[PDB]
Design a protein around this ligand. Sequence first.
Ligand SMILES: O=C(Nc1ccc(Oc2ccncc2)cc1)c1ccnc(N2CCOCC2)c1
Length: 340
Amino acid sequence: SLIRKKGFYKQDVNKTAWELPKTYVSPTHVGSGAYGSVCSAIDKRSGEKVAIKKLSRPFQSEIFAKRAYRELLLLKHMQHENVIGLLDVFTPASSLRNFYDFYLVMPFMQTDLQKIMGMEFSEEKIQYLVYQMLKGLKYIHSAGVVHRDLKPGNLAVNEDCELKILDFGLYVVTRWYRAPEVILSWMHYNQTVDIWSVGCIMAEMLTGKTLFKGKDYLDQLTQILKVTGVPGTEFVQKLNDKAAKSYIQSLPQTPRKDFTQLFPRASPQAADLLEKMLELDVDKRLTAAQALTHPFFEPFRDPEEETEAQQPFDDSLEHEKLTVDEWKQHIYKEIVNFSP
Ligand SMILES: O=C(Nc1ccc(Oc2ccncc2)cc1)c1ccnc(N2CCOCC2)c1
């Protein structure tokens, strides 16, 4: 019987107590979040900088335990350059009675797109970043996983502009990057909801300004339609929301675009790619794989880097309804069963 496993040491980080293995040193506060907090550290074994996430009271309710479990499984399942992944998982606990929390170890990312946004952006930089986005999206999609909430705050970068996607498999919150069909639920969505997000993010890189805002979903829609133009009969028919369909048929039918005019500084190839991602029709909107073939990425394209998951993300317990204690049992085993 022990207080914590050997080789662990107690240290305060950002005025909270952290219990870390010896191999991780010089922990340094990074951020405090909704369900945990993060620090950086040096893996003295390799001297490389990692990020360590302390889960906060993951076992306080079935909802917290599932979520914490889900994050672990997803990070573990994805193996891709542009998708955040797992280097290590640990807990100071020595038994189930001990089991209060666990730590996720991941590669350290200096910053994110939300924090370096606004600064003009050359098209070459845009080509490079967006190309990495699409590759990561192609990978998670191929595993049957959609992000649903892609945003600059979710795209981590280092100083070399290497990119990894975060937080995949997640009144009036801001929904600037969200797909119309999700905000209005006016037809069923596919994996190309994330592509809409990429379009909004790319557009913002080009101009320095958020593409779509609005106090409420209707004003956002009005801003979206200024750009996409009012959709034609082919699209209108696919709508499963008759009230929305009515509303759309009753609008001043303002024709689409000329994205060359909406983005008067964009290259033809960039405007063309934008046109195909900012597409209302979820059946015509580009997939990640298809957008990767676009000429806008010619200088960076390497088909070999455009991998797919070999296996679909398969959580048999995704639907299950279990007791917090049972959840801890599974999370506990996964941690034991893990290997770096
Ligand atoms: O990226 C993730 N986690 C994560 C991202 C960044 C992070 O902090 C870092 C990482 C690297 N460098 C700096 C900070 C810590 C955890 C992540 C992936 C997939 N699913 C996630 N969840 C879905 C279920 O509930 C919410 C959690 C989280």
